[PDB]
Design a protein around this ligand. Structure first.
Ligand SMILES: *[C@@H]1O[C@H](CO)[C@@H](O[C@@H]2O[C@H](CO)[C@@H](O[C@@H]3O[C@H](CO[C@H]4O[C@H](CO)[C@@H](O)[C@H](O[C@H]5O[C@H](CO)[C@@H](O)[C@H](O)[C@@H]5O)[C@@H]4O)[C@@H](O)[C@H](O[C@H]4O[C@H](CO)[C@@H](O)[C@H](O)[C@@H]4O[C@@H]4O[C@H](CO)[C@@H](O)[C@H](O)[C@H]4NC(C)=O)[C@@H]3O)[C@H](O)[C@H]2NC(C)=O)[C@H](O)[C@H]1NC(C)=O
Ligand SMILES: *[C@@H]1O[C@H](CO)[C@@H](O[C@@H]2O[C@H](CO)[C@@H](O[C@@H]3O[C@H](CO[C@H]4O[C@H](CO[C@H]5O[C@H](CO)[C@@H](O)[C@H](O)[C@@H]5O)[C@@H](O)[C@H](O[C@H]5O[C@H](CO)[C@@H](O)[C@H](O)[C@@H]5O)[C@@H]4O)[C@@H](O)[C@H](O[C@H]4O[C@H](CO)[C@@H](O)[C@H](O)[C@@H]4O)[C@@H]3O)[C@H](O)[C@H]2NC(C)=O)[C@H](O)[C@H]1NC(C)=O
Ligand SMILES: *[C@@H]1O[C@H](CO)[C@@H](O[C@@H]2O[C@H](CO)[C@@H](O[C@@H]3O[C@H](CO[C@H]4O[C@H](CO)[C@@H](O)[C@H](O)[C@@H]4O)[C@@H](O)[C@H](O)[C@@H]3O)[C@H](O)[C@H]2NC(C)=O)[C@H](O)[C@H]1NC(C)=O
Ligand SMILES: *[C@@H]1O[C@H](CO)[C@@H](O[C@@H]2O[C@H](CO)[C@@H](O[C@@H]3O[C@H](CO[C@H]4O[C@H](CO)[C@@H](O)[C@H](O)[C@@H]4O)[C@@H](O)[C@H](O)[C@@H]3O)[C@H](O)[C@H]2NC(C)=O)[C@H](O)[C@H]1NC(C)=O
Ligand SMILES: *[C@@H]1O[C@H](CO)[C@@H](O[C@@H]2O[C@H](CO)[C@@H](O)[C@H](O)[C@H]2NC(C)=O)[C@H](O)[C@H]1NC(C)=O
Ligand SMILES: CC(=O)OCC[N+](C)(C)C
Lengths: 141, 290, 49, 271, 247
């Protein structure tokens, strides 16, 4: 490399740069990090299938969130704190944690609805027509 | 790799040709650690001094002679210089001048001075901050039996959480203790034993909850186990459900007593070895004079 | 509501996961070490004087 | 060194330097740091060696750290905003040339990895008050949220400096949030204690009914029998805490977050 | 100088040993010293004298963690066993540092205070919640984690236990006691009255005296509830008393 604007008597005018364009062999990280993280993340989808009478849906969702947080802690240790871009697995972890938080909110709402009573809540006719006739038929329930 | 002294102090050339050198040195030296009786362990660290250049027929070591004419065949300790370590006491520090043959061709002799720092851990810090926490955690393992055998009974939750806490304590010990595999620390063995016991508590809680939640509409009551838990152990559709609950409670009680006895015996035997691990009585003079 | 939220969130989760990881897998270094330079800088491509 | 025939000597030695820099702990992670490099002759007095800030190539008093922007290794976490130099006159005393690096933290990494998870956990700690007591998960969720926030506090406590001249604004946020979740646990225990009451355990006083059935349900838009009365009171009290905790958390967190963002580095290196 | 007077001011980084007194950590004060003297020259050959009775702190870059309450340099003339004919001079400079506790209070003490407060709260939570043990064991785990944290902050020297270490051990014992008593209360609430008839003293205390100061099962639940009310007051007051007695 010769920098034409640099003075001929400057040290920066010339250099020889050797470059190494190296690609990571990802199979180690796929096996040990990505697959467990994805499997534990997709476990949150079981919260909807678990009955509200079980009283463990929030436990599952919050445990998935905790596991995702632990994984994010691990990866943030393995990578520099560069603000240039969010790492791909970091983007996945953030997206997963956001979805898990939304699933916790959904589960809390579902449990609230489940334990509603006519002494404490009013079941509107529109809510009945929506959630007892139309939607369960659409969902093949 | 620091073979030599840390400061090249001046030598003192006394009249009559006597030369004295007393440089200060900080030394980091190999001391194999016997972790078996931790935190009540004592360590036989050693310092081996030799000439890097000259063999035993060129340079010869002897111990300094006290003003009374007694040879100081041990590490000297000066009250004006020595500062006690707050973690390790020093019991003995004998010195021996060893001599060896040279090469296999009967080479010139070799000589080195080995000082055996026999040091002893002051255990009080670890008793308070590690041993007592681990014992208290292990106590909660036995409480799961008293928890109800019915919905809302957190027997398995409590047992697994206490197991996780003991695993965290195991991680703490694994950090403070070397990866050497020559022996297992008795504290680590106690932790492993408590973890195994906790897994057996989980199994027993699962069995108790199974038995208690059985119903005549789905399970045929075993006459042997029913009669045992009803009469033989204590004296050693609602009716069927109540019988199942009573059998579960009797199983909980008997497993509680068995686990308590086993845990107490194991913990006592494990820690007893550490208590017996005093520094041995040795002919050497104490390193620090009373 | 549980089953509706399942049918909503599960495909969204799967699609986002697949999108992210596929965008990762397709990443490769360029065929030349310097973009805009046609030379490969490779032992087999000896640029004789 | 390069020696000119007129005797002008120029020397440009490379240095690796680890200077002490008083960290502005407060506005983390939006903080900006004002680090200094103090260069002086160790031995010679100001009466023997006079230091000067290097002039520009045109002879201008370009008192700045030189940065060849075409070859400077851009740091991935810190942005250099101001880079002045000043010659400091002695108060046998020595002159000093001080170079100032005013670097702003690029906050995206910490926003994603720290602040956003904490916000999510705080939001879940809020929704604790919407979870009905009959679900039996309220202590679970509240405690797990509190513990996760405490773990984040302990982790971040290693990121921030150990100096105690001030508390980082993010640490203040975390502590306030942990106090909030502790109150959330306390009030969840209160709601559960109200819900499981019965005329064999507690008999409802006139004032409790008059408040939590008449007044609060009208504001909150809410609407064996004595057990239901305790349960209705508990539900209204649960909803009361939900809105109040919403207000306290949303206002408090926003004020703290806004305060962190407001304190941008000054446009002048010597305010 | 032309008079032959030499002034030498070399820089040094001194990694001196200091006996860290952990008793009052993090509100502790540390007396750390630097024993400096000529190694080979004795006092009859080279005499060292302190420039001033205190170290020069004029150029001191003030630490953000430690405040130097005082400093002093004392000259000494001790005689070593190596060299009994000639005492060797030294100047022992010392600094009485005091820690600025704000960093450790926030990141250690306040969470521990929260967990210790939550330790008594369990006795207000009814057994019917099915979560008293979930609270108590989680508090136990949090306190275990913070005990792990404190162990990293303090020397493992067995000279004395830190007051925060003592406080943590006390809180751990209190947590264990609270868990044991919570289990006892739960077993009392779930206690089958047919197999476990209520003794006269327990009824006379917890039904008649303490609150004034299916039914049989509810009576056991009533006893457990009155225990809960008593235990809440005791645990809450003992916590505040212990906190005050410590702080
Ligand atoms: C791994 O990392 C290394 C570095 O760590 C990467 O190596 C870099 O690779 C890039 C990509 O090629 C290089 O950038 C190019 O450099 C050449 C060489 O220019 C230099 O030498 C010239 C004389 O030899 C000189 O004129 C140049 O000065 C120019 O640049 C400086 C600095 O910006 C300015 O101050 C000057 O005023 C002037 O602009 C310089 O010293 C350049 O030719 C090339 O410029 C082209 O591309 C730019 C943007 O891509 C355009 O802005 C330019 O106008 C110009 O456009 C190109 O012109 C060609 C000729 O007509 C034409 O064929 C081409 O199509 C056209 N392209 C476009 C897009 O219009 C550019 O700056 C960089 O220098 C390398 N760094 C080194 C070697 O240290 C390496 O790529 C990485 N590998 C990876 C990622 O796999
Ligand atoms: C923090 O820790 C540091 C240590 O890390 C600790 O520092 C100590 O501080 C105390 C005071 O706070 C110091 O005590 C003072 O020491 C002075 C120096 O004492 C030495 O020198 C004396 C000088 O003697 C003359 O004559 C002798 C002949 O005897 C000759 O050799 C000398 O040339 C010299 O001219 C000497 O007398 C003295 O000997 C004392 O000690 C020995 C034991 O070592 C004892 O046997 C003797 O009897 C005698 O007590 C020693 O060699 C000293 O001048 C000073 O005197 C003050 O008090 C006396 C009353 O005791 C008053 O009469 C006098 O006017 C002064 O007020 C005092 O004794 C101590 O030396 C420091 N030690 C070290 C190691 O630094 C800090 O205090 C700690 N601080 C906190 C807050 O925790
Ligand atoms: C602390 O560590 C010290 C260093 O490891 C221990 O000292 C060594 O202890 C071993 C114990 O097995 C001794 O080995 C025995 O020595 C005797 C004596 O023979 C010696 O002389 C012959 C001839 O020169 C030589 O071949 C031997 O090696 C010995 O030097 C032998 O009869 C035995 O077979 C066996 O080798 C070491 O001799 C001894 N060395 C020294 C320098 O003291 C010490 O025991 C440890 N102490 C404690 C309390 O743990
Ligand atoms: C980054 O930190 C730098 C220091 O670490 C900051 O530089 C400081 O900037 C302030 C603001 O200008 C200065 O304070 C002024 O100082 C002058 C000069 O003081 C000297 O002269 C007066 C006589 O006029 C004398 O009384 C003093 O004792 C001094 O000898 C005063 O005239 C002003 O009133 C005012 O006090 C600091 O002096 C200056 N410090 C240094 C070491 O240069 C810098 O501003 C910081 N940057 C940011 C963005 O905060
Ligand atoms: C070291 O030198 C001394 C000093 O010379 C020797 O001691 C004696 O010194 C007197 C001086 O008056 C001489 O006349 C003697 O010849 C010296 N020798 C003896 C044996 O008395 C001393 O011998 C020398 N050697 C040693 C090993 O100390
Ligand atoms: C003579 C000599 O080097 O003595 C060093 C030891 N000292 C200074 C403690 C007496």
């Amino acid at each position: 490399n010769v920098d034409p604007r640099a003075p001929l008597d400057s040290p920066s005018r010339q250099d020889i740069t050797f470059y190494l364009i190296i690609r990571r062999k990802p199979l180690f990280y796929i096996i040990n990090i990505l697959v467990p993280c994805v499997l534990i993340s997709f476990m949150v989808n079981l919260v909807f299938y678990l009955p509200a009478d079980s009283g463990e849906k929030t436990s599952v969702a919050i445990s998935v969130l905790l596991a995702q947080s632990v994984f994010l802690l691990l990866i943030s240790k393995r990578l520099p704190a560069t603000s240039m871009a969010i790492p791909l697995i970091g983007k996945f972890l953030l997206f997963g944690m956001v979805l898990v938080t939304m699933v916790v909110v959904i589960c809390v709402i579902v449990l609230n609805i489940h334990f509603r009573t006519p002494s404490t809540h009013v079941l509107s006719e529109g809510v009945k027509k929506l959630f007892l006739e139309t939607l369960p038929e659409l969902l093949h329930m | 790799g620091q073979f030599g002294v840390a400061y090249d102090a001046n030598v003192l050339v006394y009249e009559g040709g006597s030369v004295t050198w007393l440089p200060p040195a900080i030394y980091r030296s190999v001391c194999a650690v016997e972790v078996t009786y931790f935190p009540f362990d004592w360590q036989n660290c050693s310092l081996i001094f030799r000439s890097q250049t000259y063999n035993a027929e060129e340079v010869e070591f002897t111990f300094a002679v006290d003003n009374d004419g007694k040879t100081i065949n041990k590490i000297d300790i000066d009250t004006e210089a020595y500062t006690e370590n707050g973690e390790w006491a020093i019991d003995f520090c004998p010195g021996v001048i060893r001599r060896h043959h040279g090469g296999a061709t009967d080479g010139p002799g070799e000589t080195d001075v080995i000082y055996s720092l026999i040091i002893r851990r002051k255990p009080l810090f670890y008793v308070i901050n590690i041993i007592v926490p681990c014992v208290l955690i292990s106590g909660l393992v036995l409480l799961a039996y008293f928890l109800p055998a019915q919905a809302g009974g957190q027997k398995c939750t409590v047992s697994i959480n206490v197991l996780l806490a003991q695993t965290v304590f195991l991680f703490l010990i694994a950090q403070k203790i070397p990866e050497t595999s020559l022996s297992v620390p008795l504290l680590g063995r106690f932790l492993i034993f408590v973890m195994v016991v906790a897994t057996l508590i989980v199994m027993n809680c699962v069995i108790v909850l199974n038995v208690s939640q059985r119903t005549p509409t789905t399970h045929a009551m075993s006459p042997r186990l029913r009669h045992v838990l009803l009469e033989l152990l204590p004296r050693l559709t609602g009716e069927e459900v109540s019988d199942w609950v009573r059998m579960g409670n009797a199983l909980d009680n008997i497993c509680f007593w068995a686990a308590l006895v086993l845990f107490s015996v194991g913990s006592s035997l494990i820690f007893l070895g550490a208590y017996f691990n005093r520094v041995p009585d040795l002919p050497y003079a104490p390193c620090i004079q009373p | 509501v549980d089953r509706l939220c399942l049918f909503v969130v599960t495909p969204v989760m799967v699609v986002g996961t697949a999108w992210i990881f596929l965008q990762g897998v397709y990443n490769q270094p360029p065929p030349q070490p310097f973009p805009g330079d046609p030379y490969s800088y490779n032992v087999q491509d000896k640029r004789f004087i | 060194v390069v020696v000119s025939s007129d005797g002008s000597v120029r020397w440009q030695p490379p240095g690796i330097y680890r200077s002490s820099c008083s960290i502005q702990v407060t506005y983390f992670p939006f903080d900006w740091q004002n680090c200094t490099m103090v260069f002086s002759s160790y031995s010679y007095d100001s009466s023997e060696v006079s230091l000067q800030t290097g002039l520009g190539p045109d002879g201008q008093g370009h008192q700045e750290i030189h940065i060849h922007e075409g070859t400077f290794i851009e740091n991935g976490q810190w942005e250099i905003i101001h880079k002045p130099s000043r010659l400091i006159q002695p108060p046998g005393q020595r002159q000093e040339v001080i170079f100032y690096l005013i670097i702003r933290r690029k906050p995206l990494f910490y926003l994603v990895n720290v602040i956003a998870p904490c916000i999510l956990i705080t939001l879940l700690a809020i929704f604790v008050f919407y979870l009905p007591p009959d679900a039996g998960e309220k202590m679970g969720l509240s405690i797990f949220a509190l513990l996760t926030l405490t773990v984040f506090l302990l982790l971040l406590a290693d990121k921030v400096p150990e100096t105690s001249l001030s508390v980082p604004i993010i640490i203040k946020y975390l502590m306030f949030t942990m106090v909030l979740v502790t109150f959330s646990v306390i009030l969840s225990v209160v709601v559960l204690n109200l819900h499981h009451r019965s005329p064999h355990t507690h008999q409802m006083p006139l004032w409790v009914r008059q408040i939590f059935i008449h007044k609060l349900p009208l504001y909150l838009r809410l609407k064996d029998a004595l057990k239901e009365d305790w349960q209705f009171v508990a539900m209204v009290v649960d909803r009361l805490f939900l809105w109040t905790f919403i207000i306290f958390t949303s206002v408090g967190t926003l004020v703290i977050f806004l305060d962190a963002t407001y304190h941008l580095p000054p446009p002048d290196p010597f305010p | 100088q032309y008079t032959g007077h030499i002034t030498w001011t070399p820089p040094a980084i001194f990694k001196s040993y200091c006996e860290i007194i952990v008793t009052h950590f993090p509100f502790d004060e540390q007396n750390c010293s630097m024993k400096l003297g000529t190694w080979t020259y004795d006092g009859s050959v080279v005499a060292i004298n302190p420039e001033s009775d205190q170290p020069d702190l004029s150029n001191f870059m003030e630490s953000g963690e430690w405040v130097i309450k005082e400093s002093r340099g004392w000259k000494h003339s001790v005689t070593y066993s190596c060299c009994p004919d000639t005492p060797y001079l030294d100047i022992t400079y010392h600094f009485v540092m005091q820690r600025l506790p704000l960093y450790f209070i926030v990141n250690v003490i306040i969470p521990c205070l929260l967990f210790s407060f939550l330790t008594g709260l369990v006795f207000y939570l009814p057994t019917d919640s099915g979560e008293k043990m979930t609270l108590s064991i989680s508090v136990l785990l949090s306190l275990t984690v913070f005990l792990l944290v404190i162990v990293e902050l303090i020397p493992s020297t067995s000279s004395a236990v830190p007051l925060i270490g003592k406080y943590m051990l006390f809180t751990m014992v209190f947590v264990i006691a609270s868990i044991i008593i919570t289990v006892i209360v739960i077993n009392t609430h779930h206690r089958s009255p047919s197999t476990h008839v209520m003794p006269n003293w327990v009824r006379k205390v917890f039904i008649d005296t303490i609150p004034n100061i299916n039914n049989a099962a509810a009576e056991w639940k009533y006893v457990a509830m009155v225990m809960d009310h008593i235990l809440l007051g005791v645990f809450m007051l003992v916590c505040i008393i212990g906190t005050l007695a410590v702080f």
